[PDB]
Enzyme design. Structure first.
Site, PDB file in Angstrom:
ATOM      1  CB  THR A 103      -1.000  -0.035   1.161  1.00  0.00           C
ATOM      2  OG1 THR A 103      -1.791   1.173   1.061  1.00  0.00           O
ATOM      3  CG2 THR A 103      -0.326  -0.071   2.496  1.00  0.00           C
ATOM      4  N   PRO A 134      -5.109  12.074  -4.858  1.00  0.00           N
ATOM      5  CG  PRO A 134      -3.027  12.371  -3.784  1.00  0.00           C
ATOM      6  CD  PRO A 134      -4.366  13.036  -4.032  1.00  0.00           C
ATOM      7  CB  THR A 159      30.776 -41.643 -16.038  1.00  0.00           C
ATOM      8  OG1 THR A 159      31.664 -42.770 -16.040  1.00  0.00           O
ATOM      9  CG2 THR A 159      30.148 -41.410 -17.400  1.00  0.00           C
ATOM     10  CG  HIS A 160      31.171 -42.369 -11.307  1.00  0.00           C
ATOM     11  ND1 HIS A 160      30.292 -42.481 -10.240  1.00  0.00           N
ATOM     12  CD2 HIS A 160      30.737 -43.232 -12.260  1.00  0.00           C
ATOM     13  CE1 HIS A 160      29.378 -43.422 -10.554  1.00  0.00           C
ATOM     14  NE2 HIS A 160      29.633 -43.880 -11.812  1.00  0.00           N
ATOM     15  CB  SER A 172      47.039 -13.140 -10.918  1.00  0.00           C
ATOM     16  OG  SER A 172      48.078 -13.204  -9.964  1.00  0.00           O
ATOM     17  CE  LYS A 228      45.868 -18.623 -11.382  1.00  0.00           C
ATOM     18  NZ  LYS A 228      44.457 -18.163 -11.270  1.00  0.00           N
ATOM     19  CB  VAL A 229      43.381 -15.191 -18.498  1.00  0.00           C
ATOM     20  CG1 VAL A 229      41.986 -14.656 -18.816  1.00  0.00           C
ATOM     21  CG2 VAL A 229      44.446 -14.265 -19.075  1.00  0.00           C
ATOM     22  CG  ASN A 230      41.720 -16.315 -12.903  1.00  0.00           C
ATOM     23  OD1 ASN A 230      42.428 -17.298 -12.980  1.00  0.00           O
ATOM     24  ND2 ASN A 230      42.021 -15.268 -12.160  1.00  0.00           N
ATOM     25  CD  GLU A 280      35.961 -17.192 -11.098  1.00  0.00           C
ATOM     26  OE1 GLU A 280      36.045 -16.003 -10.862  1.00  0.00           O
ATOM     27  OE2 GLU A 280      36.902 -17.939 -11.136  1.00  0.00           O
TER      28      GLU A 280
END
Ligand SMILES: COc1ccc(S(=O)(=O)N2CCCCCC2)cc1NC(=O)Cc1c[nH]c2ccccc12
Ligand SMILES: COc1ccc(S(=O)(=O)N2CCCCCC2)cc1NC(=O)Cc1c[nH]c2ccccc12
Ligand SMILES: [Mg+2]
Ligand SMILES: [Mg+2]
Lengths: 448, 450, 458, 449
Positions: free
Chosen positions: C97, C120, C177-178, C309, C315-317, C322
């Site tokens: 409300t 109103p 698998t597993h 980093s 290093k590229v992530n 993510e």
């Protein structure tokens, strides 16, 4: 196949059954899950009924003959001799009054075999109500599960992980951050982290015990203690502590809170859920370490029970179940009204299951997976020798300036630090090959 | 205490056990919960093994004497005759391979008693793998639970609520918003809302069936169908549909998605979780309307089962909490597949099949033993509606909002109807006849019931 | 600053504020989160008030000059011209409300600037109540989010995954698998599976729309429609459908169920939760296949999006996977909040609407935005390490089964053992043991060990 | 626009923005939620960057002039002067790399204004990684929220409930079990139970602080502390404790656990979820107590803001949000891999929000609802004195059958039990007025004085 007389009609009851009319009525009312109380819950109800009879006899409220008969019948239940006399569904009246009456009726039938006549309500339920008995039995069972079973199983798992952290203290390998090649670590360091997670789990369980061990007994129907002795709770708790050895059992801080809410179970489930979160990380890392052999990481071998990681699978499945049980517990916990939370049987089922699953899978994981792991030491070194290196350990030999120029050239030409040093002609009086190889040594880089 | 010889050594198996060495090893490796497969998931493994043998027979891959022995053994499992022969924990290898082998071993032992030698793997598992069988059985069990058991149970509850809505069509009472007094409704309108929640629940279960009914059978180890006939899936599904009458069973749209993920179970659990949400609202309202008999709302009386405690609303709201928790466990397992296989299937199966069972059983009990026998305090409900400050607004155009506020305050203070208060304050005149008052304060007309 | 007078007293209001006294009281009453309604919710409140004014005008209940002023003000709000004029916390009165009154006040203030006086309540809230307006606006916003934004974003991701499935149709690799070596698949088959998951996700959103699109408008305070025209709901729905093109909007099947419960939001959240579960699997597999590139699986390369980093400069992530997995986590949490609010209605009204609306609209937005970014900045530019994948498949013990019928399962196991020991292909190992001859020609071996044919690609 | 550069090359950045290349890449990479870090998170990052610079200066690794410029700029960030220079989405890389670089770049740009050249990575990020800085900033913000904000808010709510418990010690009323009339209680006793739930809430928050306050700082990229001084963590924590006065901040027990997992945020969220469960019970009971004023329970009146129970509604909506956030936190928590949990920005958003909502709503509930409740005292006593639940202590005088007849007639005629016993003519034979008044004393039956 016999008949009984309930003050609303006739009741047909199995012949070898020690339960009576009220229990058979609950069997007919709640055919929902087809599962009743667990052995731990039955045991706790027997312990509670013996303690109450002992205190009622001590205060002169119950004739010694009757009290002795309740105490002997209760001891049989607590020792698991009647686990088949509790047929009521988990999904029953939300106070657990149905299972409370089931216990009263079975004790009365056991006592009748020994020649004593007990009224289920007036004698076996003396000084108790429909509402302070089942939550007390729930908290006894949960506290026994935490202290006698779960903490020792977690300690076994902690000790197995810690033993590997020490065996593998200098087993160097590549770190992985975001699943990408990082600077070296040891397998021992990783296992020291897993062991800390389990040690913190034990700390988390210990921290909840002051509230998990709070018992409602003595508050009777609404928390006021009407129709009980003023010190009934304190006296019953002391008998329970004496007979179980569980020093964590205690009277409730506030008798209204202890019946209006089951917040202690919600709190305890949060510790179990955190343990399930930790176990998920440990189990997932271990099955990834074991993966392959040709297509995976092949860092460790798991004991065979190409070996599938069946105990990591059982651990991660148990963790999922503890997360689901934890949501059910919080939902029941929130939905009390006025003087009584009426979700106790459901909340009891869920937290006692979470305790049992974590206890059993932790001891299996420790004994049948962790203790037997073998490291693929030369493969793990090969991976460490493929990690990125840094120039920092050359500072003292070539200076901050040349080291920064090695760093820049290694990145631009996609070369190793070691090869960039050789290629820039830096091997000389300031830096032998030996000095380069010692400064960049991957086990040294792990800082073990 | 009979003794068996394995690849790894010797294991003792109970004398009357029809399982063999592989099942006994699984019993030793997974003493976790002490709870094994439920009747529905054992029945489905029997149905699946019978249909697989039928198809292997039809394709000339399996000798008919062996196929007939498997089909007869699998029918006994499907008929619930061997629910005690499945002792492996739910918390087993995540493909359900252990339970698959338990089925193969029990069928071979049943066949041996009728004089026919079956190899568990080479005959009972022919054309199948360790990975496409258990999830198929899970989806057969869930689809049957949805179509044969839960939808009819929900329809029974819908029809009970709708019958009450019709009986209570003119039972006027105070509305409540924010728990505060509001303009009139009828009990019938409220029960019409409950009925719609259950009818929408059936629509939600129906809407998930196109994907719940998808079966992985024929995809073998990774989804490719290597070591199975190319049409094994469509043949086995057609036999299952012919035998069970469950036309919702279908081959998977994508064989890889059907083994890498269990998203159909996650989807179905969301429908069950929504039904649990609806039932919580319905059951809560009913126990509040029955509260009392003095200090509560005292709108209705529940039938006495055990002053009656609302024990079936308590069962219903406890079951709903369990379904919510099971739903969280299912989604957690569902998200955490890797590459060609989701290895949370036994846990997911336990949770989804329990959720179906609890909602089926509690919905029928709630319909029959609570809803059907409710009785309304009709005159009391109408007196409270007629005594509520909420109904003075239609007086404003005759006596003004300030005299209507004074009528409201005096009615509450003196515990009188708005009508009696208007008469007591001497407002009946040329400005307001008795007849115009009764029209302005007709609370059943304010409810706007058909 | 600038004064006002509420039936309780004098209230100070910022000078450039188009809201009035009731909104300023709500600002002072709920300083809880510091977050108010989103653009999608404001837009829907504007759409709703414009349609209500149109209908009230058409039925002769509202003077045309007043209706025209409301229509013009409500179109400015639906166009996003007033997204700074809704200061009330999400954690407000559970009917919404306060936000309904905020809308009514902002419209009256816009109309005032053009010389028209609107009350109103009596004008902008005509035929409406404090309880059928906010849930209607919530359902309009959620239906718009589903049909106009989320489904097209999921279709874009589906198409990107399906394009990779086709490009990688012959890219053979070992199954897993597993997490253990298995028989061959293609990267194209795996991506066909991911595509199906997204396609199934669109089917799940489509399946919820018959109930998500149900609107409460016309039911007034308790669901009975007291103090509204009997056909107010169908008339308002007709205007909304004509103006928006949202064919899924409909009048509720039952006017009590549409106010006592918000079960359609719970239902829709389940579909979104299922999509989050699918995206978690897809994103996890993709970052595992990109892992390394020396100590991981190195099956594919993800497009580089930003430095990973300072300590490890090259290093590229996998930042997009993510972001996707974190979004999925948020959707699953939001889903639990929605179901909690859904269950806890009482009698004629569920009073968890603002919190349920926040959570369901945020899940729609996060899934829409991340799905587009995932398709454009990650999936479209993936590349496969085709020769690495094939080498592993051709060296796998799993591929000896097709030799059984020629040399027997025992000799095939010895081939697997030796190949895995000596890091050789199965093909070479069969040769190195002299099994080529009578029962097995060199082309026969190449037919049995054809790893792409073992994947059984269509 | 201006040109900035990183290892991946050249990037166009808004001309006047104080962030640089990596922040701008993150602005383009993650337009997901449209919400960035909260004030509390920016404050913690500023605190941490200043403390790292102090320790680097103290160890002679960083020139005093550079340490001073970082410390001064980090103080402007901590004080909230540059919040508009943190544009990166919550849903960014899961280590919080992007927000760490945002802090480093903004500190470099502030220092440049004052004529000091700082390299964002070589100077502002000296001895640090993202992997240890962003979880450290998250745990500083969460520990500050628990100790400085939530525990005092809960103590305020506890004290308001306990004040009612005292004020209403003799306000006898019907108990209710299963929603059904039960033997008497007082409103005071009920409020004593609500106070205990909040006191226990405080105990739950305090019990998590030994692990919530653990900081990763010093573990660098993987937990090993490579590229940092061996005592960096203990030095940085000592500076943070001195500056914040938060003695709960501590070095992690195990550096690998502190980066591979965020289990302390999961643990803390469980405490907050239990508080949400407690607040749901309290708020539900209070709005039911206030229901009516004709057709509900009409036990109490809530202060107006016929009053709708708007703060009970705010409290139960907040609780629903904390339960949702809690599920998102546990999901992130479980899904770490090897040396890093990459769910930190999402877990941080959720737990910091749960702290904020519980803090703010607890104060509001305490001050604007609890403090102003009024009890319908005479009405509550009349219903208690009229309840069939209190006939039981007559059974021994009048028998079960007549006790049932008394309860039935009292309900039908709307009279007290005392008046019904007199009306049925039971005084004299069975019991005296003195005995009746002893047996039916509802305050004595509630075991209150
Ligand atoms: C659960 O609410 C109730 C339960 C029972 C009864 S009863 O009928 O058994 N009985 C009434 C008749 C005389 C004897 C006393 C009690 C009334 C009530 N409510 C009320 O009085 C409501 C009420 C109206 N004016 C008020 C002014 C102040 C406070 C409350 C109210
Ligand atoms: C919300 O419950 C109430 C609210 C208001 C009032 S009141 O005071 O305003 N008022 C009392 C005088 C006449 C009745 C209607 C008006 C009473 C009630 N309860 C009751 O009568 C309780 C009750 C006692 N005997 C009964 C027998 C059948 C049904 C209900 C009851
Ligand atoms: Mg001890
Ligand atoms: Mg490899």
């Amino acid at each position: 196949y016999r008949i009984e007389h309930d003050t609303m009609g006739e009741v047909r009851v199995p012949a070898k059954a020690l339960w009576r009319a009220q229990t058979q009525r609950a069997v007919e009312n709640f055919p929902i899950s087809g599962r009743g109380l667990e052995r731990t819950q039955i045991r706790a109800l027997g312990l509670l009924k013996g303690a109450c009879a002992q205190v009622n006899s001590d205060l002169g409220l119950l004739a010694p003959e009757k009290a002795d008969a309740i105490i002997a019948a209760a001891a049989e239940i607590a020792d698991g001799q009647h686990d088949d006399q509790f047929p009521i569904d988990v999904f029953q009246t939300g106070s657990g009054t149905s299972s409370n009456m089931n216990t009263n009726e079975v004790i009365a039938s056991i006592a009748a075999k020994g020649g004593v006549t007990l009224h289920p309500n007036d004698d076996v339920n003396m000084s108790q109500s429909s509402n302070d008995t089942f939550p007390t039995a729930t908290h006894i069972a949960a506290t026994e599960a935490a202290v006698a079973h779960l903490i020792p199983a977690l300690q076994q798992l902690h000790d197995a992980l810690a033993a590997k952290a020490l065996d593998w203290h200098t087993v160097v390998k590549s770190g992985r951050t975001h699943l990408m090649d990082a600077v070296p670590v040891t397998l021992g360091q990783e296992f020291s982290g897993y062991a800390r997670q389990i040690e913190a789990g034990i700390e988390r369980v210990r921290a909840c015990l002051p509230r998990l061990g709070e018992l409602a007994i003595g508050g009777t129907a609404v928390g006021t203690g009407l129709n009980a002795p003023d010190d009934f709770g304190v006296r019953v708790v002391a008998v329970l502590v004496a007979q179980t050895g569980l020093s964590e059992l205690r009277t409730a801080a506030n008798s209204f809170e202890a019946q209006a809410a089951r917040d202690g179970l919600v709190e305890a489930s949060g510790a179990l859920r955190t343990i399930a979160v930790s176990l998920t990380k440990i189990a997932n890392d271990i099955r990834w370490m074991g993966s392959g052999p040709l297509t995976g990481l092949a860092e460790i071998q798991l004991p065979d029970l190409k070996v599938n990681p069946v105990l990591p699978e059982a651990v991660t499945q148990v963790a999922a179940q503890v997360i689901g049980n934890d949501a059910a517990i919080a939902w029941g916990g929130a939905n009390g009204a006025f003087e009584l939370n009426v979700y106790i049987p459901m909340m009891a089922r869920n937290i006692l299951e979470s305790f049992k699953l974590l206890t059993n899978v932790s001891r299996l994981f420790a004994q049948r997976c962790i203790a037997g792991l073998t490291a693929n030491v030369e493969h793990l070194r090969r991976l460490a020798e493929s990690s990125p290196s840094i120039v920092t350990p050359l500072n003292s030999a070539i200076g901050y300036e040349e080291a920064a120029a090695v760093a820049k050239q290694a990145l631009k030409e996609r070369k190793t630090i070691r090869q960039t040093v050789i290629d820039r002609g830096l091997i000389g009086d300031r830096l032998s090959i030996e000095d380069l190889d010692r400064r960049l040594d991957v086990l040294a880089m792990a800082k073990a």
